[PDB]
Ligand binder design. Structure first.
Ligand SMILES: NC(=O)C1=CN([C@@H]2O[C@H](COP(=O)(O)OP(=O)(O)OC[C@H]3O[C@@H](n4cnc5c(N)ncnc54)[C@H](OP(=O)(O)O)[C@@H]3O)[C@@H](O)[C@H]2O)C=CC1
Ligand SMILES: NC(=O)C1=CN([C@@H]2O[C@H](COP(=O)(O)OP(=O)(O)OC[C@H]3O[C@@H](n4cnc5c(N)ncnc54)[C@H](OP(=O)(O)O)[C@@H]3O)[C@@H](O)[C@H]2O)C=CC1
Ligand SMILES: NC(=O)C1=CN([C@@H]2O[C@H](COP(=O)(O)OP(=O)(O)OC[C@H]3O[C@@H](n4cnc5c(N)ncnc54)[C@H](OP(=O)(O)O)[C@@H]3O)[C@@H](O)[C@H]2O)C=CC1
Ligand SMILES: NC(=O)C1=CN([C@@H]2O[C@H](COP(=O)(O)OP(=O)(O)OC[C@H]3O[C@@H](n4cnc5c(N)ncnc54)[C@H](OP(=O)(O)O)[C@@H]3O)[C@@H](O)[C@H]2O)C=CC1
Ligand SMILES: O=C(O)[C@@H]1CCCO1
Ligand SMILES: O=C(O)[C@@H]1CCCO1
Ligand SMILES: O=C(O)[C@@H]1CCCO1
Ligand SMILES: O=C(O)[C@@H]1CCCO1
Lengths: 279, 278, 279, 277
């Protein structure tokens, strides 16, 4: 177990991801809010104000975030990453671990930029998701060419405080993006629709929202704690001739399964395009 | 808080195991204060209840005599036969909690009232995630259930997940939403994992990531004051990977399928309510 | 607020957009009709005659419009824009603000043409829509390379008199075109169909058109004045088991949402396509 | 013009709140002339209505005693219970205005006439945009409504939107069109915003632009003597962006989905009543 409670963390970008991670870390108690600095050009944004009330240091100056930070998260859109690297590359020091969270952007492209200024930049690529805000994120990371022995362990310890975290080979991360990165939006869509179905059949909206969300949470937790296949868990719900198997039929008749496959594929493929676009 | 109270299950299958495991993990009931009965003493769910410390028997009358709260955890078409069997054994102290999909309070009271008047009946709809103490449960109180009977039930079932009282005429819809709900999620998680596998993830990792993503999103919604659509908006950046995937969901009518599912399960439950009452 | 009550405005092109803007500006009382001039090569057109009855000055000669104008709107079709710039480029003076309304046409292409004649053309690109004719348009604009300090402020002040107006980065305007530029046609199609539905269920056509249009106007205004997500207002107004949620289901079963996404995307892509051909 | 008139709401939900707020914003009633009652009123609604100047009570009989015009703004299956509760308290002066989907004048008059003959009953269908004074309202007059009662109703509801008299047999169809209409619009605006976001717009800007486009287009049609198809033709330049988007709407049967929606809501409305009768 590595000690990191005293280190300073910075976010280039002060948007949804910066807020979600900063909220998760502080709510986990593993970092003090004043250890965190975030920067963006527009300092009148809603996420910036949300970060403000949390106690995070805010500035328009990306260089200040770099000078403040030990671990530096890149939390801008993919096409902005190369501009950021040109802007702050000269301010990267030997102490810095650069953790890119941008969809699609390769370690190789980041190291190429930063190596123009200083050899051996310590780079880690991450994909996470917004439920880090409730400490139930799904995070993977890959270590770059010059990442020190314990840089990967440090990032795993830090990110494990706000959800599941595991090291992966970098060539998996675009597919992770399509599954758990975009995944919450799939779930919010599903929850909205399930609530609509509950309302159609006579439930108050607030109850339908609560029951749907609790059903999804409980089922997901069951699967995480089970050694059983999701199909077996499915079999355990449905009684012969019963209500559940009738509902499963109408899902199958609409190709429900194929739509979720389509979604993971579409997000992964778009992620690969966001890299060739920023390239 | 629930010291001295005895609980019994008529039926020893998926739901009886789930509830018994959840109650005992919650510490609200000692396993030996729980008795379950089913005809086949060799079944797998009875094997695990035994290892859990739950008293087991093949005779439904033993469960009735042991219990204060009596859970009916048999299939809907088996309830009328159970009530015929144990009807003469219902005492004044008993609270009979039917878990069966579609079986109406009216049908249970009519059966039991032939043996002794004022049976205290509660109908509930729960789901299998009570086994990890994250269930979703509603209940409706019967004609002769005392107000404190509904309160006791809510406190007991709140130990294993969300629990709230509803009017009985909403239980069919709840069945279609949170009762069948886990099966929709297991289907979705299997398909999401297939999608991860297609794009190059190992199956075990894809399952873990998809399930963690669903759990985290559901917790976000429960801990948020905000609309699911608002949370959808907040997490879909312009031109990004997520909004591209949302479009292909929309093009297949994803939302309508989940509406169809809740409706289909509810309507089938109503057909079961009509069988119970006819 | 800038004093511009006395300035002169010109339209190259005397068609649907020139009429809608001139009608909105004069109805707002911010420009006098005799301070507006519009040109097109055919002087017996219906929009020309409509502009005529409004008191706008009309001419076949684009050079006359340029010489008349302080603010010069380009309201010709996208493929006509480069010919106009070649025609009038030598007549552009220091006083001129050139406001292109053409779908897809980039500030860069306009400045490149005009710069061959005189350096530092003051260029603004906008996207608007025909409801400026009832002073409820939706307008965005981006400022060009040589736009002076108050050129953007002037154009926002002018266009705010006929609807919503805000500055954007130019790279958003093709998307805006697919949303609020083409938006009114989506609405007219929807209103025709809703009225057909009213008629099928027994309403006189005139009443069905009136009710459908009032419903759409009121709902849009409700959303604009609420601090609410449209899904929340959908949720709030629906009732369990009720008529609305049954109708929402049949919309969903048809993939209604996906069609509107398809439309915005198709209009935006077509807008981008035409400009790639122009380049 | 309604110097002394008092208005009551039985119910305090989405519709009662929207009408009370629209009437308040219109300034058509004197101060403290609105009362609303419900049995378990959400505290956020209590707070909002109280700050607005609206009187509140859990007792429906008190609303009746307060009111000259009494709006019934409860769910359709709740209407007959309300009529049984308040029927003995209806007075000569009262105009009872049912807002409930599906519920016929006939059924209301039969309930009320058991207590006192000649209840003055009006049935309306409106929509939540009355809250911004842009509602769409129709009404039908009952058997004993005096002719001036329908005139008063029209003048009152005209202060918060369009309002016109119809035969009662049109109201279920109106419900499917302008009653449910706003929900169709909110769905469309959410989808249009998703489309703007997909093509690169910030969500907040996409929502603002889509809503403004819808508002402006609707106002154009209301202020035009032309067919919506003709207004469509004026945007659709040959080979242009708009006609390309219209094609993909047509390829998905966009128009038929909206016809399906109006039909489905109207048919369900007829079931919200054929079940009650
Ligand atoms: N949100 C999610 O669900 C997840 C997102 N990600 C990744 O995180 C990154 C950001 O996503 P998200 O936070 O959602 O996007 P946001 O739009 O919410 O945040 C973007 C931030 O970048 C800021 N920014 C823009 N230009 C600069 C600049 N030159 N220097 C510094 N900051 C700048 C913006 O400020 P302004 O608005 O003022 O330009 C805004 O604060 C993306 O690459 C995405 O792939 C990864 C996992 C999950
Ligand atoms: N599983 C779920 O997801 C949920 C199910 N429910 C309801 O719970 C009830 C049971 O569900 P589930 O547990 O899944 O079904 P199972 O089939 O898994 O368990 C059924 C049990 O009933 C027993 N049984 C059959 N006949 C008798 C009898 N005459 N006397 C005593 N026990 C008997 C069976 O024993 P044997 O195997 O020996 O026949 C078995 O132990 C159903 O009514 C269902 O609607 C409600 C919410 C969630
Ligand atoms: N209509 C809309 O909904 C919106 C349109 N726009 C943009 O506005 C521009 C015009 O659109 P719209 O007004 O609809 O198209 P119209 O066809 O209605 O008007 C086009 C005008 O250009 C005139 N014209 C053709 N050649 C010349 C020329 N060489 N010199 C001067 N005028 C000429 C035409 O005259 P003749 O008929 O004699 O050729 C006609 O008066 C387009 O670029 C479009 O993208 C932007 C937002 C909304
Ligand atoms: N929502 C809409 O878009 C439109 C709805 N309508 C019609 O308006 C009526 C109400 O709809 P809506 O306002 O949406 O429904 P809501 O559910 O939002 O409001 C229902 C109201 O009825 C109240 N209520 C329930 N029982 C009683 C009672 N015994 N005495 C008094 N009040 C009671 C509820 O009380 P509590 O506050 O205690 O829960 C709540 O205030 C319906 O008939 C609907 O058809 C018509 C046009 C538009
Ligand atoms: O299909 C069934 O019978 C049960 C009821 C609710 C969960 O699945
Ligand atoms: O939509 C996107 O591009 C990012 C990546 C996954 C979460 O949201
Ligand atoms: O959904 C319903 O039943 C009501 C009537 C129309 C507006 O919402
Ligand atoms: O269809 C077109 O190309 C024009 C321009 C954008 C609005 O409608």
């Amino acid at each position: 177990n590595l000690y990191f409670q005293s280190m300073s963390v910075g976010f280039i970008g002060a948007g949804q991801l910066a807020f979600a991670l900063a909220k998760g870390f502080t709510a986990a108690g593993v970092l003090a809010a004043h250890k965190i600095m975030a920067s963006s050009p527009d300092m009148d944004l809603a996420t910036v104000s949300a970060l403000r009330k949390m106690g995070v240091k805010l500035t328009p100056h990306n260089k200040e975030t770099v000078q403040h930070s030990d671990v530096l998260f890149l939390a801008v859109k993919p096409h902005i990453i190369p501009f950021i690297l040109d802007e702050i590359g000269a301010d990267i020091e030997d102490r810095h671990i650069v953790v890119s969270c941008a969809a699609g952007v390769t370690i190789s492209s980041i190291e190429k930029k930063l190596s123009a200024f200083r050899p051996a930049p310590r780079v880690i690529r991450c994909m996470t998701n917004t439920p880090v805000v409730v400490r139930e994120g799904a995070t993977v990371y890959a270590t770059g060419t010059h990442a020190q022995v314990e840089d990967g362990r440090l990032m795993e310890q830090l990110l494990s405080s706000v959800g599941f975290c595991t090291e992966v080979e970098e060539d998996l991360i675009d597919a992770v993006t399509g599954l758990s990165g975009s995944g919450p939006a799939y779930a919010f869509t599903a929850l909205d629709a399930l609530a609509d179905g509950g309302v159609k059949m006579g439930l108050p909206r607030r109850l339908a929202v609560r029951l749907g969300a609790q059903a999804l949470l409980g089922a997901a937790k069951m699967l995480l704690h089970s050694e059983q296949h999701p199909g077996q868990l499915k079999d355990n719900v449905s009684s012969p001739g019963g209500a559940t198997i009738h509902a499963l039929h109408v899902l199958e008749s609409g190709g429900f399964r194929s739509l979720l496959i389509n979604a993971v594929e579409a997000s992964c493929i778009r992620t690969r395009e966001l890299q060739s676009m920023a390239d």
